[PDB]
């Protein structure tokens, strides 16, 4: 039920992307104070800069201009009360 509004575990949510276009990783959370980390598999953290990558607790991560670097398995992580919670997204190019 928390911290992610919609959690995808073993079966990731598939998201279609296009290079040069906005990509939203929709791991919105149930309250705005939850710190969420974005990792690209295997172990590649994407830090939001408020520019090319924005965090919005009500929307998820917004990537204004998606690149080849965002193709693949993306995971949002949040830690609550000593527990690590994960939700998974698999991107691939529209065509
Ligand atoms: Na989600």
Numbering used by the authors: 132 to 226
Sentences from the paper on this structure:
Three receptor types have been highlighted: VEGFR3 (also called Flt-4) regulates lymphangiogenesis, VEGFR2 (KDR/Flk-1) is the primary proangiogenic receptor, whereas VEGFR1 (Flt-1) has been proposed as a regulator of VEGFR2. In this study, we showed the presence of a metal site at the dimer interface of X-ray structures of human VEGFR1 domain 2 (hVEGFR1d2) solved in the presence of different divalent metal ions. The three structures are similar and reveal a homodimer with interlocked hydrophobic surfaces buried at the interface and a divalent cation chelated by four histidine residues (two from each monomer). Importantly, the dimer interface involves residues that lie in the core of the hVEGFR1d2 surface that interacts with VEGF-A, VEGF-B or PlGF.
